[PDB]
Write a protein that binds this ligand. Structure first.
Ligand SMILES: [Zn+2]
Ligand SMILES: [Zn+2]
Lengths: 78, 78
């Protein structure tokens, strides 16, 4: 279901507009919005990432927190 | 957008598995998959490279076709 980026993007309703990282960027990096604050969680490795700050890379933070995530490693590539 | 290696890697869905060079290696060398055959194109210098053969170096072929590419010269280094 969440293999599709659009389905991930739909979980971002009410995502804080004041966040330095956008909902589209986070969805692209494999994240789903948990609904609380700025906490997102990867559909694949289940790692959660929060406390986003200016200059952050959605993919960069994702790799840092979960270096062996299959999604980031291209496991779902058609 | 494509400055991020992962975004380049995502363009490789359906990239021929029989190719002597892998999608990850090509993405690392700054290439995006054009979707046709084994033709990839650099996000930075726009040079396209195809006809990959055993023993080929993704970065090597990239330099040969586009010696002044900013990406290969490290222009995007943080
Ligand atoms: Zn993950
Ligand atoms: Zn180039």
């Amino acid at each position: 279901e969440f293999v599709e980026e659009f389905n991930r993007l739909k979980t971002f309703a009410n995502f804080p507009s004041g966040s330095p990282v956008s909902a589209s960027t986070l969805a692209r990096a494999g994240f789903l919005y948990t609904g609380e604050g700025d906490t997102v969680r990867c559909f694949s490795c289940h790692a959660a990432v929060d406390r986003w700050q200016y200059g952050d890379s959605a993919v960069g933070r994702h790799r840092k927190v979960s270096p062996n995530c299959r999604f980031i490693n291209g496991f779902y590539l058609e």
